[PDB]
Amino acid sequence: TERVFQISFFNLPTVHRIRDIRSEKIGSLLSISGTVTRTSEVRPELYKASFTCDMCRAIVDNVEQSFKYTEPTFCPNPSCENRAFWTLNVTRSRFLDWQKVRIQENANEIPTGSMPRTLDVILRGDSVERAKPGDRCKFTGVEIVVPDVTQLGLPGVKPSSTLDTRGISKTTRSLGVRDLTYKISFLACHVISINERDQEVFLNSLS
């Protein structure tokens, strides 16, 4: 259909630690480093979903799934005028390769008395399986946020969202309340570590 392109930035001026990750840098390019502990099996991630409407059994395709399962809003046929009822058909959909790496802090980066921090890096596209457990790898990519329901019970005023009930024309319970609790994750577009059994291939690629 269409080739998906992966822009892989690298050679950033600075490399950040896991504990240097802060919420100001959400959705920004940056490089981190860490020791890989666990890697997921590459798994298919819904990239361009196809949807079938229950009223109009047409097929709407190329529904871009940015970061989460998102049904469309308008049907292709003008008569249906439906927005909330759709079915995902998996064969007629498109997928990407997704691996979730877990990275601990390097042994030389852990502060005094503190315990190592862990981060969930998301490898996508051709960067999957480029990191294996034990290796110290540096990742370049986006610092993103993912839903974290475990923040319940934590101290503080956890953010929440409510639908705006003005300009709505009541006649004389429509809550729509969600929990805006997130945790910082990483989406890597480039992995480099910081099968050789053949002699000639080893000598060929060497200065």
Ligand X SMILES: Nc1ncnc2c1ncn2[C@@H]1O[C@H](COP(=O)(O)OP(=O)(O)OP(O)(O)=S)[C@@H](O)[C@H]1O
Pick what 183 binds: Zn ion, a copy of itself, ligand X, none; C-beta below 5 to 8 Å, kind-dependent.
Answer: none
In Å, what is the CA distance from 44 to each residue of 103, 109, 118, 127?
21, 34, 24, 14
Contact with a copy of itself (CB under 8 A): which of 26, 55, 163, 180? 55
What is the total count of residues that contact a copy of itself (CB under 8 A)? 4
Is residue 57 at the binding interface for a copy of itself, with CB under 8 A as the rule?
yes
Q: How far apart are CA 37 and CA 136, in angstroms?
A: 9
Chain centroid to CA 111: 28
> Quick one: what does residue 57 bind among a copy of itself, ligand X, Zn ion, none, with the CB cut-off 5 to 8 Å set by partner type?
a copy of itself
Residue from 53, 101, 128, 187 touching Zn ion (CB under 5 A): that is 53
Pick the stretch among 9-17, 34-42, 49-57, 166-174 that binds a copy of itself (CB under 8 A): 49-57
Can residue 163 be called a binding residue for Zn ion (CB under 5 A)?
A: no
56 binds Zn ion (CB under 5 A): yes
What DSSP designation does 51 have?
Answer: E
Smallest distance, a copy of itself to C-beta of residue 158, A: 45
Q: Is-contact 33 106, C-beta < 8 A? A: yes
Instruction: Give the interface with ligand X as residue ranges (CB under 6 A).
Output: 38, 40-41, 43, 100
Q: How far from the centroid of its chain's Cα atoms is residue 129's Cα?
A: 16
Q: Which residues are CB-neighbours of 166 under 8 A, at least 6 positions away?
A: none
Residues 94/1, Cβ–Cβ less than 8 Å: yes
Q: Which stretch binds a copy of itself (CB under 8 A): 54-62, 82-90, 122-130, 175-183?
A: 54-62
Determine, following the binding rule CB under 8 A, whether residue 56 of this chain makes contact with a copy of itself. yes
- Dihedral in degrees, nearest 10, Cα atoms 163, 153, 183, 15: 140
- Residues forming contacts to a copy of itself in the complex (CB under 8 A) are 55-57, 79
